[PDB]
């Protein structure tokens, strides 16, 4: 036996009214598939001979071990866009910019415009607040070598005449000068100074003074000749005073110094010396001494004398002459 | 031939004891299946009529594309997951509230404390270090147009008594004033100066002044007339000086004005004059000049006139008296 | 019928002339498959009894739904990768190093080094700008409670001798002082001052003060004794003048105290008062008033007296003795 079966186009099977018997094999000539018979159905709807079952088929690929979009997509979800964040790189370019509390170089303006809490008092109070407590530097140094400048190093300025507190204020403790100020051998001459005062107030005095010295002046002066020239300074003085009208003024009753005591003082109120040797002085009470000949250009008007070494007066001298003038008349 | 081969259900086959031939076809009625015999298994150990291994399929998919679990976590796993990660949008929201090197405003107090590596000396120390040289604006600009306030525009304090440095140091070169102060005329009237000290310090001067000037006083005062009125300012002064004793002290022996000369001058050592004209001074020998009468409530001692505009003594006179009643005693 | 096929093994039917005639069966003994024939090909060309097709599997795996390698990889290159990305803890640590606009610590030196675009004029210009106009609180508050230092609170200072503005600018408005300096009382003395200047400069005064009181001295000086002690400040003075010699120069011709009126003042010109009382005084016209008898070691010279309360002269008292020498002469 060769055995041959049934056997047509799938197509021609496809619209054939054959039904193979239970097991009987009909052949596909053009794809070389057969299917066999259930006795009833149609070719078209019988099954093939063979299975078509994916999960009976052997070396499967490992689907369980592939990635679903799915599962994919919510992994992704949670990662970082490149778009929405900075790198590293961008982010050390824009840190770089901002000053480090450790410190740094400003290279523009530092502007203060507290919104203030209270901005407290005392030594927790202030935009910029310096405790130099634990060490040895400055606080604020401020300086410039340029040759010209349009501004000042430092500038206070109030703008409201009530401002009722002060533009500087200077509370020290310690062994050396609270304030010094050094204006030091020019090369090109200022006219100007080291520290200079003007006040259009006139309800207070442009400068205050006061100390509780036991021994020296509360304010001393000292000039010292800029030239090893003898007379060279003989215009030059520790202390000079002008007393001036206001421009377009009618003049001024103004006096040059004014000397007090308030509580009574038994000081001279006026002492010169020269080399320390009293030259001229204004005792307590308003007597002076002076060491040498002097001059008036005009007359002198004081008591009479009572001592020998007493300045006469012309009615000390007009009653002697008379007194002695009417004694020598005896001729009776 | 219509063929019909050995048939019945798959469980069935599943414990039938029957040997198909070699090749000999069997039929599973209920899968449509065939399997044929090697001569010696029983059905159920026999194997599909035709392939069912993967590797012989066509239209394959293409599983070696597909992206595997573990390859893509190990992708994942080097990205940045969005939690720990600043979009640049809350980036920039953080550096906006950082100062820029460039410049920028504070709302805040900026407090220094310096750690203190040794804050340097000269113009490299400093908390806030400012320097000048290149630039022509001012260093540190503090104002306010505030009416009221409660604290100063600047303060400085030093708490421990040793302390031995400066408050304030100035150290200029240059060609106007080193340090300026303006307080300007007053609309609302303070009764307070430009400048006011006050020093408790019994060992030391409440302020001190140097300077070495051709032909200039060191201190330089000008009063001016606040008004046209001639006499208006009649209790004014250029230099007003008190004295007075310490808050329940039994009085005071301090001078009013000291002035010495320690080399030795041959200035005047009081000049006083009225526009530009001498009127009083005090010689550096202590002889004094005055311009117009003058008086004195007492009396003066001095020494014998020698010349005939001296003024003469009650000596003098007395002698010459004396002389003239002696002489005319001539009468025997 | 038991039916079997031609067979042999695959690898002998590879090579077999064998033509199994269109439909008829032939078995690869060593695999179990079956191929039928198309009366024309080869075994080997045959393909087997049923299809082999992927699509027409049934129990398919959901291959659409898997990850592609390529569709993955172009989602991961959106994503950022985190080596190039700082995580939210680094990004922390990095601005809370940075300084806040709302304020904070510097434990390190704020330099400035301005670029310059003009670093403007007035209230707009400065390294640093504090404008406390809306605001309450201090402006630069500089202290220090440290035991000593080798730096001031404050330092200013020029280095080139052309420099055209000033260390510090004080514009003041208000009521209290613009400037005020307090060394309050020391417990352990220093031998200095609330203020020292020293100026080498001799074309300026060292300080140059102007006011315009109407009833008060532009420049106002107390001093309080230190002391209960009635006598213990007797070597004090509010004002302390000397007059030096330049070291290694041969003198000087310097003045004491030099006082003009420039404008011509009907005040006095130097009024020296104890207790408010008038004691001595210099008058505009150089007159002077002393309370007190006086003394002169040396002469005076003065003009002849027209009052009796006038001091004598030496002529005057010989032209009275010569007149009354002359009339007595009554002896023919």
């Excluded at 490149?82 to 502007?111: C, F, I, R």
């Excluded at 533009?167 to 000068?177: P, R, S």
């Excluded at 006096?255 to 010169?272: A, F, V």
């Excluded at 002085?281 to 007493?310: C, M, R, W």
């Amino acid at each position: 036996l060769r055995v041959q079966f049934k056997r047509m186009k799938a197509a021609e099977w496809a619209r054939s009214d054959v039904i193979l018997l239970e097991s009987e094999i009909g052949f596909e000539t053009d794809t070389g598939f057969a299917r066999a018979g259930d006795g009833h159905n149609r070719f078209s709807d019988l099954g093939y001979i063979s299975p078509l079952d994916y999960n009976l088929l052997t070396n499967k690929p490992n689907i369980d071990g592939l990635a679903t979009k799915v599962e994919t997509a919510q992994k992704l979800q949670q990662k970082a866009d490149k778009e929405t964040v900075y790198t590293k790189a961008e982010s050390k370019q824009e840190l770089d910019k901002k000053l480090n509390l450790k410190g740094g170089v400003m290279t523009g303006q530092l502007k203060f415009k507290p919104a203030a809490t209270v901005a407290y008092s005392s030594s927790t109070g202030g935009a910029v607040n310096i405790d130099l407590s634990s060490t040895r530097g400055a606080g604020v140094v401020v300086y410039s070598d340029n040759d010209t400048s349009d501004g000042p190093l430092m500038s206070l300025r109030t703008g409201k005449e009530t401002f009722n507190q002060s533009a500087l204020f200077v509370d020290y403790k310690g062994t050396t000068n609270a304030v010094n100020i050094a204006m030091r051998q020019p090369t090109t001459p200022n006219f100007s100074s080291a520290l200079n005062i003007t006040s259009g107030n006139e309800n207070g005095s442009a400068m205050q003074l006061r100390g509780s010295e036991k021994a020296l002046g509360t304010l001393k002066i000292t000039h010292e000749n800029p030239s090893i020239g003898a007379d060279y300074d003989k215009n030059a003085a520790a202390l000079s005073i002008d007393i001036v009208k206001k421009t377009n003024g009618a003049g001024t009753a103004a006096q040059g110094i004014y000397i007090n005591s308030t509580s009574g003082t038994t000081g001279k109120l006026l002492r010169i010396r020269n080399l320390s040797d009293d030259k001229f002085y204004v005792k307590s009470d308003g007597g002076f001494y002076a060491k040498e000949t002097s001059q008036i250009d005009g007359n002198l008007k004081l008591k009479d004398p009572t001592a020998n070494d007493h300045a006469a007066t012309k009615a000390y001298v007009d009653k002697a002459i008379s007194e002695l003038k009417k004694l020598i008349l005896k001729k009776h």
